[PDB]
Design a protein around this nucleic acid. Structure first.
Lengths: 130, 124, 106, 170, 61, 185
RNA sequence: GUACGUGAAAUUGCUGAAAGCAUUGGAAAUCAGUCUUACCUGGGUGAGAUCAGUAGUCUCUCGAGACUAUGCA
RNA sequence: UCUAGUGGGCCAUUACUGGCGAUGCGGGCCGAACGUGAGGUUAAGGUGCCGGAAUGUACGCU
RNA sequence: UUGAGAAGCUCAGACGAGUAGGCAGGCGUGGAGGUUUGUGACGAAGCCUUGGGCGUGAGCCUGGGUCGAACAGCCUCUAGUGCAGAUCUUGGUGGAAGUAGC
RNA sequence: GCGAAACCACAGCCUGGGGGCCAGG
RNA sequence: AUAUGUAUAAAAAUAGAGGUCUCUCCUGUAUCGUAGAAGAUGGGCGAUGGUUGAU
């Protein structure tokens, strides 16, 4: 099961990767950075980090900013998968917001990580008829 | 008589909070330098016989009755003459077939059941 | 001026205590205008209460009351000992209590 | 169902006989007492008679609007105001049953208890109003003749800064 | 919404509500502090349906 | 009798006695303001407190008389506890008399007054002069501001007394005051 | 869902809320259980049975249980 | 009759005597020998504030 | 007056630190015999739980969640029966640390 | 990009009196 | 640039001040406000009052 359900099924898409050969600590900081963004902005941010434009800040494992290429490569593909899952699910692509991106450790085989991403549509409030 | 309890807190073991390997069941402190065994100030209490409750209201639930664990219908019929003194309690391993039969019988007998709403639904 | 008050203002001083051991079960209350243990004999047995605010609408009100009773004088300077149905919180030291006039004998 | 089914611990014979209650000395009938608790706190009320435990007191209803009510002698301040002539009004009718509350009943059937629109109101019957008016008639001349009684009873008792009850003499 | 009181029964409320102008009676059954069922009867003798509610969420939740 | 806010004129009061009175009030939930803290008095000759302070100078070293009194109260409170820190925030010790406080009644503490506690002829020091010698440099302006406030307050008292004359004369004019004067009023 | 029965603890991530060992209580969150329907008394209407100024069957030991008829004072 | 454990030392007054040691509690050696509690009253020490309790009364020195 | 589990019930009074050491009564686990017309796919056992209860305690009972095949009380029998530590053994996992470093 | 290891009761402001106790900063 | 009436204002001295040669202090236990279905609905008499909300 996915850890969090921050939306409804008709208005969300998920993509995940298990036992990914990367580093758990670097992935956690990248995941913390892109959490809460929009799919269009996150794609721009990950490409910027790749082409030495912006650096991923380190908050818990600072020992500051850096440009982890392996971590962003995994998150770029996972978000592309989640975007594609939104196409097949008939979702709109303008309100797509990364609602819950989480990174968990994997069986030591190194420090592999499990990554899950859930992208939802921007919740809106309709005007009250009064 | 009212059901007076001298103490309501559990007698936690010393340093059961410090360590997860150390359980919270009471163990007398066998140590010879133990400050808490020495009953200093602020040290947590130790089971003494003086906390023992009144022999007249020992084993009594707050409603003045005593729990009598029951496994079938034949057990609740033993409590016919002690319904002001005892309460039936259905065991956790009794199925929902029997639980209904236990509860229905005990209702006519005027016996309180502590867990009569378990494993069942209402239809009315 | 406005009136409608039938109580004597009092302060929750502290608990009954020695130098290092405290007893929350009895509280020390200073009453307005009572400055000796002879005058404190008047207020014995009166009902003292602590009134405070809350957030839940218990029976449609934000008010909450802890009742009590004056038990005996304390010291020489008009302090009294008050027993409350629930022991007063330690955060209410110096708070304002209300010493009603009932039960009355004068 | 009559032969006992249980141990039936019969209570040992308690030796607590019921003796008449000795009230205060200052709670003589006709005195003006300040009500301390209840909805009518702070009202000044004339005492009529001394019941077994309480005082049957009432404010002249045309003065302060305090009807005929019981009050415990522990929730009244007995003042030294001059007493009101109350010997002219019968008071023997005010008994325990007179002040008792309506015994629970409300004869109902199992179709109106659901869809609960049958509850009457407990409006005070006429004879209670008539007794109150009769008492007012027998009390008003006594309070009118002596000055300041009418304004005193229509007033309310309330403390202010500088008022110390342990030293004020009521 | 009439709070259910006393010894009245669903077959008795239906008759009572039928003469009082009601046309459908819903009975929310709970036990153990959870609303698990809902029976509705079409007044006066219409078909009666028995449902078991689940995943009951309030507006706060 | 206690209320929520009191203003205390610190002139003629001893430092320790007034602080101990103030500290007990603060722990009782009473907000206390002390004004004219530079008129506080200390028992003993000037040099004695002077050598006490310079020994203290030999921790933050504060020279203002208002903060000299504040330290005195602070040592008399449980400052290490949340209760004591709450009490300390209820105390506003100021030098001179701020305009927000010169229009309000100011009480004095008889148990702390120097006249009622010091034998006549006993040498005594003033906190204001002691502070002005250890580094405080505002007593000129504080004294000058005191004269202006005292002059303005004196005019107010004269206006109040003049208005009081009319009502005082009209008191005995009405025969009711003598009709039932037997009540003692 | 083969990294597959159950799946504990140490441990890690995310979300939510709060804050920056014992005693006693406050606030917040939560929870336990809690009764009305019965007793007595009176009458009306019918019902029957252990009732019949009543007849039979079976099992035990005159009458003790179980019955099947028939009546309802 | 048997049958386990020990045959250390330290402190203080006058080798003796106690006390510590297997002993927590109030005060800071003095007081006090401990089941769980309610209430009352005290010992030692205390009552300006921290701190529960007289910024008591009276006589004096600084 | 029913209050004989005579191993029961009932009356009274005193007493309560405790190392070594002695005595007694109890709680728990694996297996054995007997027993409960015992529990169990309408859910056994286990595990989780700011749900409740009992016992001074060792501990026991229970609600809910999870689970899926066996289990328990009582009377005796028996023992490879109770852990916080032995720089204990084995396994698992941390902070050090994304540090030293390549 | 890869990536340890030893070690770890618990943790880390000073002064005085008897690294947490007492009173202060 | 954008909280139960929350009432009370002279100075300085205790071996002297204030007010008009005279008077007062010796604490505020005083002074101001204090009755109303938590403050209702009307009438008369006497002064130009008092309390206020909004400009």
């Amino acid at each position: 099961r996915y850890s969090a359900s921050p939306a409804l099924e008709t208005k969300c898409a998920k993509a995940r990767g298990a036992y990914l050969r990367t580093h758990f600590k670097n992935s956690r900081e990248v995941a913390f950075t892109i959490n809460g963004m929009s799919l269009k902005k996150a794609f721009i941010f990950l490409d910027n980090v790749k082409e030495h434009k912006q650096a991923v800040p380190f908050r818990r494992f600072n020992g500051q900013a850096r440009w982890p290429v392996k971590s962003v490569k995994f998150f770029y593909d996972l978000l592309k998968n989640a975007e594609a899952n939104a196409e097949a699910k008939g979702l709109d692509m303008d309100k797509l917001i990364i609602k819950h991106v989480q990174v968990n450790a994997a069986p030591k085989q190194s420090s592999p990580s499990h990554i899950e991403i859930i992208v939802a549509e921007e919740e809106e409030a309709v005007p009250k008829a009064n | 008589v009212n059901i007076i309890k001298k103490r309501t807190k559990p007698f936690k073991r010393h340093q059961s909070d410090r360590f997860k390997r150390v359980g919270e069941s009471w163990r007398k402190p066998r140590g010879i330098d133990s400050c808490v065994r020495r009953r200093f100030r602020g040290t947590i209490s130790m089971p003494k016989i003086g906390y023992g409750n009144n022999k007249k209201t020992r084993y009594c639930m707050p409603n003045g009755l005593k729990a009598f664990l029951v496994r079938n219908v034949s057990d609740v019929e033993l409590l016919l003459m002690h319904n002001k003194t005892y309460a039936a309690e259905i065991a956790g391993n009794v199925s929902a077939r029997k639980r209904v039969e236990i509860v229905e019988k005990a209702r006519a007998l005027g016996v309180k059941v502590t867990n009569a709403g378990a494993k069942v639904r209402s239809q009315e | 001026a406005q009136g409608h008050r039938l109580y004597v203002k009092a302060k929750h001083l502290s608990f009954q205590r020695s130098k290092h051991v405290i007893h929350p079960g009895t509280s020390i209350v200073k009453i307005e205008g009572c400055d000796s243990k002879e005058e404190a004999q008047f207020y014995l047995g009166k009902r003292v209460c602590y009134v405070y605010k809350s957030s839940k609408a218990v029976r449609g009100s934000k008010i909450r009351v802890i009742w009590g009773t004056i038990a005996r004088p304390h010291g020489n300077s008009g302090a009294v000992r008050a027993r409350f149905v629930h022991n007063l919180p330690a955060k209410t030291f110096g708070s304002s209590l209300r010493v009603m006039l009932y039960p009355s004998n004068i | 169902k009559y032969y006992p089914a249980y141990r039936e611990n019969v209570p040992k014979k308690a030796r607590k006989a019921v003796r008449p209650t000795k009230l205060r000395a200052s709670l003589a009938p006709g005195t003006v007492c300040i009500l301390l608790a209840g909805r009518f706190r702070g009202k000044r009320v004339v005492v009529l008679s001394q019941l077994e435990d309480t005082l049957v007191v009432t404010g002249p209803y045309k003065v302060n609007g305090v009807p005929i009510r019981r009050v415990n002698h522990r929730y009244v301040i007995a003042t030294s105001a001059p007493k009101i002539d109350v010997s002219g009004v019968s008071v023997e009718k005010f008994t325990k049953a007179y002040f008792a509350k309506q015994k629970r009943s409300g004869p109902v059937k199992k179709d109106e208890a659901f869809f609960a629109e049958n509850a009457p109101k407990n409006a005070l019957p006429a004879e209670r109003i008539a007794d109150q008016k009769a008492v007012d008639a027998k009390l008003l001349p006594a309070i009118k003749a002596i000055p300041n009684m009418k304004e005193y009873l229509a007033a309310s008792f309330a403390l202010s800064n500088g008022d110390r009850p342990h030293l004020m003499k009521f | 919404f009439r709070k259910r009181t006393g010894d009245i029964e669903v077959h008795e409320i239906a008759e009572a509500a039928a003469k009082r102008g009601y046309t459908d009676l819903l009975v929310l059954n709970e036990d153990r502090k959870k609303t698990n069922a809902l029976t509705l009867v079409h007044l006066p003798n219409g078909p009666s349906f028995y449902f078991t509610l689940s995943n009951l969420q309030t507006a706060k939740e | 009798e206690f209320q929520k806010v009191v203003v205390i004129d610190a002139k003629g009061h001893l430092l320790g006695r007034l602080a101990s009175v103030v500290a007990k009030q603060l722990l009782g939930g009473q907000k206390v303001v002390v004004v004219r803290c530079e008129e506080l008095n200390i028992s003993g000759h000037f040099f004695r407190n002077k050598l006490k302070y310079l020994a203290y100078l030999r921790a933050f070293h504060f020279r203002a008389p208002s903060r000299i009194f504040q330290k005195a109260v602070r040592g008399m409170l449980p400052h290490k506890t949340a209760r004591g820190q709450a009490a300390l925030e209820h105390l506003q010790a100021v030098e001179g008399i701020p305009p927000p406080f010169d229009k309000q009644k100011r009480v004095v503490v008889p148990a702390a007054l120097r006249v009622l506690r010091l034998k006549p002829g006993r040498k005594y020091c003033t906190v204001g002069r002691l502070s002005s010698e250890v580094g405080w440099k505002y007593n000129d302006i504080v004294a000058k501001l005191e004269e202006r406030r005292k002059v303005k307050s004196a005019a107010f008292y004269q206006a109040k007394l003049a208005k009081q004359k009319k009502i005082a004369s009209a008191k005995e004019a009405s025969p009711v005051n003598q009709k039932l004067s037997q009540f003692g009023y």
